[PDB]
């Protein structure tokens, strides 16, 4: 019945120990990346940290810094800021 | 046991309780135990009036075959209550209307 033999309980010992591509974004700018950003952010009707990371291969942190400098140089216009996401446009006079 | 507990219910009822129930549980006739209830009148158990009226006590008695437990419940008459509600929460005692003869002639009584 329910009680197994000691030899069968030895199958507890016989159980044994058996059981059930990264992306390479920039993270550092160069002259070529610097040229790329000020030529393309005039495009990208919507600019944010994630969009810059996705479509310019910047390492996120430097994407944030570049956004502040793009703001300082005025090519960008704010819609909202937050300590975890920011929303930006091309400083468009169209809207 | 039978005569003794019947004496208790008879005593309590003539003493004026609205109901009583005495149960003896234990070995009694044979080794296997059973429980006998000798209730009479009527007893409530559930509603809060159980605290108000139901007096209860349990005592163990020890003899040669073992132990027996006696539970006594006594629903005292709420009408006799010197304190607490005079009657159960569902008691609705309507006061009878004093019969009035209809008057036909208007009249005025001077001072």
């Amino acid at each position: 019945l329910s009680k197994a033999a000691k030899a069968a309980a030895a199958l507890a010992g016989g159980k044994k120990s058996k059981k059930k591509d990264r992306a390479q974004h920039a993270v550092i700018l160069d002259q070529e990346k610097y040229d790329r950003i000020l030529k393309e952010v005039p495009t990208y009707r919507y600019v944010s940290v994630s969009v810059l990371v996705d479509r310019l291969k910047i390492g996120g942190s430097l994407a944030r810094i570049a956004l502040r400098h793009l703001e300082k140089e005025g090519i960008i216009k704010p819609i909202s800021k937050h300590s975890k996401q920011a929303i930006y446009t091309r400083a468009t006079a169209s809207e | 046991i039978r005569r003794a507990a019947y004496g208790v219910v008879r005593y309590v009822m003539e003493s004026g309780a609205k109901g009583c129930e005495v149960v003896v549980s234990g070995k009694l006739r044979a080794a296997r135990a059973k429980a006998m209830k000798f209730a009479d009148g009527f007893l409530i158990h559930s509603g809060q009036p159980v605290n108000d009226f139901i007096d209860t006590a349990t005592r163990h008695v020890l003899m040669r075959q073992g132990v027996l437990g006696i539970k006594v419940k006594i629903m005292r008459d709420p009408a006799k209550s010197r304190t607490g509600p005079k009657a159960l929460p569902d008691a609705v005692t309507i006061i009878e209307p004093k019969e009035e003869e209809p008057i036909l002639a208007p009249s005025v009584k001077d001072y």
């Binding site: - | 009657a87 929460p89 569902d90 609705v92 005692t93 309507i94 006061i95 009878e96 209307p97």
Partner: protein
């Protein structure tokens, strides 16, 4: 369900059976009437009894 129970109906009907002239169709007057004319033991039960009394008064007015 709001189905009033047997005790409510007994007390309600008993009141009307002997206090029709003094009762009214207004819940408030019958409730404050009931408070003194019957020895109901709780406010909740009193309101239930009062409410059904007026319900039956409306019924009698119907026919």
């Amino acid at each position: 369900g709001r189905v009033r129970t047997k005790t409510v109906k007994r007390a309600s009907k008993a009141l009307i059976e002997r206090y029709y002239p003094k009762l009214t169709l207004d819940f408030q007057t019958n409730k404050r009437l009931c408070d003194e004319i019957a020895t109901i033991q709780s406010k909740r039960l009193r309101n239930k009894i009062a409410g059904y009394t007026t319900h039956l008064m409306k019924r009698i007015q119907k026919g």
